[PDB]
Amino acid sequence: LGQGDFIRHLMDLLKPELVRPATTLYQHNLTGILETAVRATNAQFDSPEILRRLDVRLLEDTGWDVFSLDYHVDGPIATVFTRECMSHYLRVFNFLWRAKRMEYILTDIR
Amino acid sequence: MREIVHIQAGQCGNQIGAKFWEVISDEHGIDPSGNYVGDSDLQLERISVYYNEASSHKYVPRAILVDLEPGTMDSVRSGAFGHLFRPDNFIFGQSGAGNNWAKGHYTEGAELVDSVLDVVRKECENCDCLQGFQLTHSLGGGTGSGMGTLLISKVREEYPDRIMNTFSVVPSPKVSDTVVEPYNATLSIHQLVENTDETYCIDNEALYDICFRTLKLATPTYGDLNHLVSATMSGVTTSLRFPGQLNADLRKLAVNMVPFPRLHFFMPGFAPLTARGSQQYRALTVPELTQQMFDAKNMMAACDPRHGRYLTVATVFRGRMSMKEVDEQMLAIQSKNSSYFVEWIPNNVKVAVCDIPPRGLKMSSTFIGNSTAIQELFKRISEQFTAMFRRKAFLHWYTGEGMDEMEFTEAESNMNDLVSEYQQY
Amino acid sequence: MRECISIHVGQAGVQIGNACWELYCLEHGIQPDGQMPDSFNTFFSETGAGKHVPRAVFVDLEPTVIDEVRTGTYRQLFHPEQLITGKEDAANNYARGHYTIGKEIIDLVLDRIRKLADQCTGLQGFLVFHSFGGGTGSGFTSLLMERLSVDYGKKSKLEFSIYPAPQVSTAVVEPYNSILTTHTTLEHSDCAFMVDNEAIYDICRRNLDIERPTYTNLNRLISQIVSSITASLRFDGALNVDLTDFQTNLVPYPRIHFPLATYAPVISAEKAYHEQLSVAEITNACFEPANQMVKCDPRHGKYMACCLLYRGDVVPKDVNAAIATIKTKRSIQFVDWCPTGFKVGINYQPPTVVPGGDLAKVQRAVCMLSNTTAIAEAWARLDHKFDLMYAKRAFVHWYVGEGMEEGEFSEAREDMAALEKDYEEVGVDSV
Secondary structure, three states: OOOOHHHHHHHHHOHHHHOOOHHHOOHHHHHHHHHHHHHHOHHHOOOHHHHHHOOEEEOOOOOOOOEEEOOOOOOOOHHHHOOOOHHHHHHHHHHHHHHHHHHHOHHHHO | OOEEEEEEEHHHHHHHHHHHHHHHHHHHOEOOOOOEOOOOOHHHHOHHHOEEEOOOOOEEEOEEEEEOOHHHHHHHHHOOOOOOOOHHHEEEOOOOOOOOHHHHHHHOHHHHHHHHHHHHHHHHHHOOOEEEEEEEEEOOOOHHHHHHHHHHHHHHHHOOOOEEEEEEEEOOOOOOOOOOHHHHHHHHHHHHHHHOOEEEEEEHHHHHHHHHHHOOOOOOOHHHHHHHHHHHHHHHHHHHHOOOOEOOOHHHHHHHHOOOOOOOEEEOOEOOOOOOOHHHOOOOOHHHHHHHHOOOOOOOOOOOHHHOOEEEEEEEEEOOOOHHHHHHHHHHHHHHOHHHEOOOOOOOEEEEEEOOOOOOOOOEEEEEEEEOOHHHHHHHHHHHHHHHHHOOOOHHHHHHHOOOHHHHHHHHHHHHHHHHHHHHO | OEEEEEEEEHHHHHHHHHHHHHHHHHHHOOOOOOOOOOHHHOOEEEOOOOOEEEOEEEEEOOHHHHHHHHHOOOOOOOOHHHEEEOOOOOOOOHHHHHHHOHHHOHHHHHHHHHHHHHHOOEEEEEEEEEEOOOHHHHHHHHHHHHHHHHHOOOOEEEEEEEOOOOOOOOOOOHHHHHHHHHHHHHHOOOEEEEEOHHHHHHHHHHHOOOOOOOHHHHHHHHHHHHHHHHHHHHOOOOEOOOHHHHHHHHOOOOOOOOOEOEEOOOOOHHHHHHOOOOHHHHHHHHOOHHHEOOOOOHHHOOEEEEEEEEEEOOOHHHHHHHHHHHHHOOOOOEOOOOOOOEEEEEEOOOOOOOOOOOOOOOOEEEEEEEEEOOHHHHHHHHHHHHHHHHHOOOOHHHHHOOOOOHHHHHHHHHHHHHHHHHHHHHHOOOO
């Protein structure tokens, strides 16, 4: 979440979707929303290569409990991350996602 | 062998047919000048179902381009792949029938249908083993709806045993592109119920939703919509054409999705639909294709299948894939959505698998659905038709062309019988 | 001398025949062009030179699969006139394959089969490979079997049929075709070795470690079964078993003739390395309910006849000890009117591994054909699906408008009910 500008728009577009239960959620729909955010925010001016790996994954309730980004990496660069950094980032990304919706709720009440 | 005669009627039909022949020539490696420039032998193994070999090994599409106005003929001829069709297969008139079903079915449709019937008879007598016909048109249009209807009726009474399947663009729910759309649509559907084996109902608004939400197209033009419809047509007749692990022609699909003669209206679909941005984040697997094709957002008609029950479905897969994965995905789909499938038909899915995927893809699949949610589309058409007919709006045109109010009453009664049958089943 | 003709009908039959004839060519050393760089006589014929033409016909109503055969690696093995094909398939319709499209081809097929029979000296019988839930695999198979019974009213007619699976299914009208085929061929067949795609999928996943098998692996396993069945005709062994032996030892009553096929040493290379597969082990694997290639639990019924066909480094004493162990088991129960329910065949030729296959090279193998009352449950499921679809009268117009009558539907359903009653009667103990 070090970008901030991109995650702001991404939390405004997933609001109408994640409120529904997880059973009606299918991954093929959210990708069009993520792709829309990367185009509108400042993340468009970015290396096309790294943007090819950034996608969504569905953890396996409510839509605010199974959504998370993945950024899969394979090849030579995969010897630095080694399937454990990707099992640690997602362990972190939840705590930064919760502490981000608990704030945009409290600026909506305000 | 298993030759198909393709007829394009009206503006919508002609444009969709032009895109269809573009994608078919791409599949079979045919140059826009008609020459084969492909790489594999399977492209010429079954070129005969769609093409006729001319003198200098040039392949002429077995297509008849019929319209009541010359503008579309000129546009098709002048554009790319326009020097592909036989110049004797452009059968057009001068007055464009307006947006009048009666004009295209009774006054100008008569002369033009005699001419196009002569052309179609020549094309059929040239064929070795005729599999059937396919028509591209729009029900809400003028020459398209009425003339496609008249041609369908006459070809049906000439060739009753052949498979007549149409890819018809139905009126949209929200915004109409023609004021008299319900009249033309109702009359066309009344005629399509009895003289067609497979009607693939396509709505432009569902296509707009697909382009905007799934393909993330900022400015989707009619080219993209026609490309989607052409991909569906491709998939079906590709199951017919190329070798596969589980073959299925037009007649096999007709047998497996038409439980009763009048219940032959389908919602088409296409599984591998991805935006250019998301093509790198998505895994192309049979489960992904199945999940997308059975999604209510992907279906190409604005009829939610969750409001009805699938009588039958057909999945035409393309590419090298494992039959076990296909069958297990089909079983999982049937088990999870047991409430969305008819109980008195066990195994509501017909599976076909072809070995050759479309150009640029590794896997693909088309979804055909005989569901009781088409009753919603026919209900909308019926409400609009009765709303205009009760106060007799825009009716003097149809009456003056030579029709009668009794024909309108019969058409609406037949469409109400159709919705009654769908609701009953 | 003991020549036998194999007939492959439909896509399933033709592809299984592809696998079977690949296996036969590998076993007998015949190159895919018919030349060799006797044993190869019950299935091949010699034409002057080293050319060995297989004694089979490949008949389909669709040019696609047969054309794949005509242009494949075995393009020059089969006689071009024995690869019979139509123009339009039966479209999963029994009526099309039996009445409308099958009548335009049956004469050519019978002429070719007559040529093959005349070329033979002593005809043991026919091997019909087909699928139950296909158009030409049902209608044309039934038509061909009835015509063969009219012509060769004494030769045995064994058919290898792909029984529809309990859950997985590729067609919607499979119950109709299956019931009608069962009617027509049950009138005119000797014994039908049955197999399921779902069961072979489960076998592949559990034993061969394959998570994504195709029809190719299924066809290879089925071809191994057929090779084990015909090894006695093709090779020399301690206990030879002919086709008439199968017919006599596996069919107690004329209608109850649907045994289930099994193959014990289905194992990958590494697992085969770590195991010591012996006669007792392979026999126990054969009688394991999870290794059945028809998805029917044998514990739900009673065995009436078993045909254990061993091959390779097999000792008769070990076979006897293993069979005695099986008989002493309490989970495996036999009908009370068959105190001796084991036909045993032993062959000296170990199974041949196909290059590119998944089965590991083993020293011995066994194929078990078991006639059991557990198939009655599968019949009950099939007729239940038929009853639902026919009560709604779905798809019936497709069959009726193609040379059939609804009376045939009712008669076929009544015949299947009689077959279920017969299975129930033979199941019960004598008092």
